[PDB]
Amino acid sequence: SPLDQFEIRTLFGLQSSFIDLSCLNLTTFSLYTIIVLLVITSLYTLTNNNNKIIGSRWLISQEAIYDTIMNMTKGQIGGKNWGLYFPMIFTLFMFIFIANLISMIPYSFALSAHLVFIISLSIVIWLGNTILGLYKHGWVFFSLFVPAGTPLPLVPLLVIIETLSYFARAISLGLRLGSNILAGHLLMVILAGLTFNFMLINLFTLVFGFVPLAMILAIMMLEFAIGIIQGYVWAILTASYLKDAVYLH
Amino acid sequence: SPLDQFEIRTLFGLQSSFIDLSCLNLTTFSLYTIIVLLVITSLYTLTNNNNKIIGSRWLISQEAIYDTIMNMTKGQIGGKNWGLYFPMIFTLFMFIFIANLISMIPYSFALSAHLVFIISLSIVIWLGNTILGLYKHGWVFFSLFVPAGTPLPLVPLLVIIETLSYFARAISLGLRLGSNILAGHLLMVILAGLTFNFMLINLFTLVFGFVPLAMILAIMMLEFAIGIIQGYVWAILTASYLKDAVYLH
Amino acid sequence: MPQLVPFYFMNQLTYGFLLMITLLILFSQFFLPMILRLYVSRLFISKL
Amino acid sequence: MPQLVPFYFMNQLTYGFLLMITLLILFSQFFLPMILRLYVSRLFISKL
Amino acid sequence: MQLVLAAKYIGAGISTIGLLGAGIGIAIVFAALINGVSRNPSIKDTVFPMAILGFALSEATGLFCLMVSFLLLFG
Amino acid sequence: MQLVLAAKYIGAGISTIGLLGAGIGIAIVFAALINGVSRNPSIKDTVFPMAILGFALSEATGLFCLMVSFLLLFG
Amino acid sequence: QLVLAAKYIGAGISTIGLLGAGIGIAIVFAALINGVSRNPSIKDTVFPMAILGFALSEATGLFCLMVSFLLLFG
Amino acid sequence: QLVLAAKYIGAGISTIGLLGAGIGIAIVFAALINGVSRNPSIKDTVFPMAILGFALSEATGLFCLMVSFLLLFG
Amino acid sequence: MQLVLAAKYIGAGISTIGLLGAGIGIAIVFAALINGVSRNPSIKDTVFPMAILGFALSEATGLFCLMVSFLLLFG
Amino acid sequence: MQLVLAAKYIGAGISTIGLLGAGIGIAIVFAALINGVSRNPSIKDTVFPMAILGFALSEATGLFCLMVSFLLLFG
Amino acid sequence: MLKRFPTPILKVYWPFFVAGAAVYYGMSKAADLSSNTKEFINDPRNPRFAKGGKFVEVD
Amino acid sequence: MLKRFPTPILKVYWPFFVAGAAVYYGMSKAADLSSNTKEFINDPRNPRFAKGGKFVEVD
């Protein structure tokens, strides 16, 4: 069982017999959400030395993240009011960016590799695009489903397999991230499990047994890239989707 | 199942997986201990109108209980220092006296009818007599086990079946009270269960069906007597036992 | 008997002995001497 | 897969959405404008 | 389940015997009451509540043996 | 399996005969209480704690038998 | 398992001996009450004899209870 | 229950059609990159055509995934 | 019962062929990225978000196939 | 359990095919790298990290298909 | 420390919150439907056992 | 309200408290020995299930 690293264990506990209060209780998932919140709080509270203008070396990091997500959501929705949807496009980044660096620490735990939470967050953003689009643009919201000047005898086919791609968008956006984080962690644990039993046979294998160690180091080098790039790709697709929902093509 | 009135149900709940914190949690037994403590607090705090000397009509009750337990423990241990063991001889009364009037209220619950707590309290008082007796009187504590001037060829028999009566005292003192409260409540519930199905047959039984109701009323009249007398008998036997343990006959 | 033998033994005994130590300290230091103050006060006004 | 289908669905989703609403209110009202105050201050000293 | 229900009836039969204790008991209390009133007719309102108390406390031991029979008949 | 519950209920029926040893007990105690108060009217406040003591401290031996009956019936 | 059922009959029958114990404690405290009521100045003299006789009579009722516990638990 | 095991083989084989979808999205964005790099002033003109072609190609890769879900869950 | 797990593992093996449709995908995207940067050195900061977008938004279709493989293997 | 362990080996055999995606993939990336250096030898230190990045991101899709084979061999 | 600025976060983001409540409710019913399956009816940490009922255990 | 009087409740009642600790410990071990019997090993509210182990269930 190489997948035991994702087990959810209850720690602080709470129960009753009147009402099902077992929904909220401090758990491994919940404790790592508390840790994510305290890290994100720590990146801005004690980072700023006594509210100085000059912005010490720690604040350049949270300066660059801010600027690379402003200049990304200005180039996507880019209309009359792009900044009204900027806090959500930033707080969808920082959760995924911090929750995929915390998960790299060896005896730790991936928030992002729970499909039930990430798929739920994706369905929340998809319904919050459809409701916002219907509210802002009435019955002509469905004009999104015809591409451009197209010949009329093939328009209903191009409507059906446009709407099918419109509600595949509900689960695709989440399952991309879930699949990347889950496959990366499962790859690292399985190769560690193979190189461990590689190094317990006869003593000639601990000699020149440095090359599988170097391969695992190279995969860990790759895994930060595949963890930060997904945190960026989430925040670019849910900027493009707000471009479609707010502005009709 | 006429004995379902003694079920213990968990209410507020607490658990973990690190440590077994399931010992303390608010439960039916625990909630009725909170109620007993608040009643005993209520019998003395708001009873005294603004710390008046004259002692209003409520305070005559807690005056008479005090005086009838002072004049009872002065006539049992009655030595140089009888008052040093007077708070325990009073707080063994008031728990059993209040916890057997609260249990008379119809949809309520007997603290006293749990054998595991009362037998434990009895074993606590028995070991606290033996340890106190050994500490105060050395190796000659065992002089309690010979009655008086007796012929020597039958002294060891009269020692063996004196010590057997000495450690039957550990469970007898508790199981007396447990048996009285449990048998009284089980009697009332079984006779209520019989008179209920007596009154659901043909309409001639609700006519002149007043006599079993009067029999249940008479048993409830008896049950306060059998509940207060046991609260007194506990506090007289654990005064006599401290007479034996403190003073060697 | 089924009802007086559950897992709740340590529950019963824990809140019971907490209540016993509570009532012992509570009676002895608070509530018995607030009656005895009434006694000594009544006798002190009586002796005058 | 066995590990991502427990009973803990409402646990996961409850603390997750509490953290999302928390970070949303928290970022938007606190931490983004404390960077933007730095921006407007730097530009105000620059324009003078 | 015919054997256990046949044993229930025998057990309810055996749990009837303990009523003779109360039947002699109430009588010994009231016999002492009569022999105490005849020695002294002035102590009636002092003695007679104790006789009623002994009546009740022995009738309780009678009913504690009746209730086992009522369990073994039905419950 | 029927035999175990059958003999269980029979033994629980047998183990309530000892309450006739408690009914007569409470009887003789309150009988002596009545005869002692009647022949000396100023002994009540000295003999009454011994009466209550002897009453419950004699019942206890019938209640032991009732607890053997309860451990048979329900345990 | 006839023995597992027949030990319960024995535990029931061996509890009958408390009949003597209850009547015994009654006769002891009955004589104590009569002795105090006849001679009012004998209570502190003869009361430990009453407590002694009670302790002996209970223990010799208690033999039946410990035999019942050995049959029911051993 | 041969059918309960043979639906899993079908759900495995019916997932091969995403091979075309991945290569397809690659060829679309490859032509988009080449078209922007040759003519720098065509991005805002031709980018919705790229998003359209991606949406069509995924949906026509997605047919295989929904057939796999019908075989695995229906 | 062996047949269910056997065909389960065979189908999980079959459902990883679709990753060759993602390796070539990432290849063609970064190949066009290289050829587009090389023939115009001032387009990198405009073409790089489209490169990352096309990269992950093309892998997703291989990761769907890997999730079908995981639901076969472990579900 | 001979059938399921025979199916494990076949599944590990099938999950080898997805490596051809990476085998063509790394090559298409480096082929574009060569054809981009030959058109412009001045853009080397700009282009070559993107080639290494595409190498890594396609080798990840190769290893995602290797790990299923390593599960089906042993785990 | 930090000066709170009253940014409009309710007259902008209401359909996200409405969708959040809807997905919360739908996942509640999905969890209740999944917690009674054949595989998971005897896992002792489900919240059925903390209130009343015990051990259907007929499969 | 109430004036606390410092009554000696420790240099008088120590063997009661020592006996209380001893009976507490002995009942702890008795509860642990009784919670693993044949009748009560499948009652789901025992504290075994809240930490680790699940369902011996071989009787």
Curated annotation (Swiss-Prot), chains A, B:
Family label: Belongs to the ATPase A chain family.
Keywords tagged on the record: ATP synthesis, CF(0), Hydrogen ion transport, Ion transport, Membrane, Mitochondrion, Mitochondrion inner membrane, Transmembrane, Transmembrane helix, Transport
GO molecular function: proton transmembrane transporter activity
One GO CC annotation: mitochondrion
Chief location bin: mitochondrion
Bilayer-spanning residue ranges: 26-46, 82-102, 115-135, 140-160, 181-201, 206-226
GO biological process: proton motive force-driven ATP synthesis
InterPro entries reported for this sequence: ATP_synth_F0_asu, ATP_synth_F0_asu_AS, ATP_synth_F0_asu_bact/mt, F0_ATP_A_sf
The protein's name: ATP synthase subunit a
Record PROSITE patterns: ATPASE_A (PS00449)
Organism: Saccharomyces cerevisiae (strain ATCC 204508 / S288c)
Subunit comment: F-type ATPases have 2 components, CF(1) - the catalytic core - and CF(0) - the membrane proton channel. In yeast, the dimeric form of ATP synthase consists of 17 polypeptides: alpha, beta, gamma, delta, epsilon, 4 (B), 5 (OSCP), 6 (A), 8, 9 (C), d, E (Tim11), f, g, h, i/j and k.
UniProtKB/Swiss-Prot annotation, chains C, D:
Keywords assigned by UniProt, alphabetized: ATP synthesis, CF(0), Hydrogen ion transport, Ion transport, Membrane, Mitochondrion, Transmembrane, Transmembrane helix, Transport
Function noted in UniProt: Mitochondrial membrane ATP synthase (F(1)F(0) ATP synthase or Complex V) produces ATP from ADP in the presence of a proton gradient across the membrane which is generated by electron transport complexes of the respiratory chain. F-type ATPases consist of two structural domains, F(1) - containing the extramembraneous catalytic core and F(0) - containing the membrane proton channel, linked together by a central stalk and a peripheral stalk. During catalysis, ATP synthesis in the catalytic domain of F(1) is coupled via a rotary mechanism of the central stalk subunits to proton translocation.
Membrane-crossing segments per the record: 13-32
Coiled coil: none
Major location category of this protein: mitochondrion
Organism of origin: Saccharomyces cerevisiae (strain ATCC 204508 / S288c) (Baker's yeast)
Family: Belongs to the ATPase protein 8 family.
InterPro entries, A to Z: ATP_synth_su8_fun (IPR009230)
GO molecular function list: proton transmembrane transporter activity
Compartment list: Mitochondrion membrane
Protein's name according to its UniProt entry: ATP synthase protein 8
GO biological process, one term: proton motive force-driven ATP synthesis
GO cellular component, one term: mitochondrial inner membrane
Membrane topology label: Single-pass membrane protein
Swiss-Prot record, chains E, F, I, J:
CDD domains: ATP-synt_Fo_c_ATP5G3 (cd18182)
Name of the protein this chain belongs to: ATP synthase subunit 9, mitochondrial
Annotated positions for site Reversibly protonated during proton transport: 59
GO cellular component: cytosol; mitochondrial inner membrane; mitochondrial intermembrane space; mitochondrion; proton-transporting ATP synthase complex; proton-transporting two-sector ATPase complex, proton-transporting domain
Gene Ontology biological-process entries: proton motive force-driven ATP synthesis
Positions of transmembrane segments: 14-34, 52-72
Organism domain of life: Eukaryota
Compartment(s): Mitochondrion membrane
Primary localisation category: mitochondrion
Membrane topology per record: Multi-pass membrane protein
UniProt function note: Mitochondrial membrane ATP synthase (F(1)F(0) ATP synthase or Complex V) produces ATP from ADP in the presence of a proton gradient across the membrane which is generated by electron transport complexes of the respiratory chain. F-type ATPases consist of two structural domains, F(1) - containing the extramembraneous catalytic core and F(0) - containing the membrane proton channel, linked together by a central stalk and a peripheral stalk. During catalysis, ATP synthesis in the catalytic domain of F(1) is coupled via a rotary mechanism of the central stalk subunits to proton translocation.
Phenotype when changing residue 46 to L: In strain: DS400/A3 and KL14-4A
GO MF assignments: identical protein binding; lipid binding; proton transmembrane transporter activity
N-formylmethionine carried by residues: 1
PANTHER family: ATP SYNTHASE LIPID-BINDING PROTEIN, MITOCHONDRIAL, ATPASE PROTEIN 9
Family annotation (PROSITE patterns): ATPASE_C
Species annotation: Saccharomyces cerevisiae (strain ATCC 204508 / S288c)
From Swiss-Prot, chains K, L:
GO cellular component: mitochondrial inner membrane; mitochondrion; proton-transporting ATP synthase complex
GO BP annotations listed: mitochondrial proton-transporting ATP synthase complex assembly; protein-containing complex assembly; proton motive force-driven ATP synthesis
Name of the encoding gene: ATP18
Superkingdom assignment: Eukaryota
Homology family: Belongs to the ATPase j subunit family.
Pfam families attached to this UniProt entry: ATP-synt_J (PF04911)
Organism, scientific name: Saccharomyces cerevisiae (strain ATCC 204508 / S288c) (Baker's yeast)
Quaternary structure note: F-type ATPases have 2 components, CF(1) - the catalytic core - and CF(0) - the membrane proton channel. In yeast, the dimeric form of ATP synthase consists of 17 polypeptides: alpha, beta, gamma, delta, epsilon, 4 (B), 5 (OSCP), 6 (A), 8, 9 (C), d, E (Tim11), f, g, h, i/j and k.
Other information: Present with 6540 molecules/cell in log phase SD medium.
Keywords in alphabetical order: ATP synthesis, CF(0), Hydrogen ion transport, Ion transport, Membrane, Mitochondrion, Transmembrane, Transmembrane helix, Transport
Name of the protein in its database record: ATP synthase subunit J, mitochondrial
Transmembrane segments: 9-25
UniProt membrane topology term: Single-pass membrane protein
Subcellular location: Mitochondrion membrane
Principal localisation: mitochondrion
One term of GO molecular function: proton transmembrane transporter activity
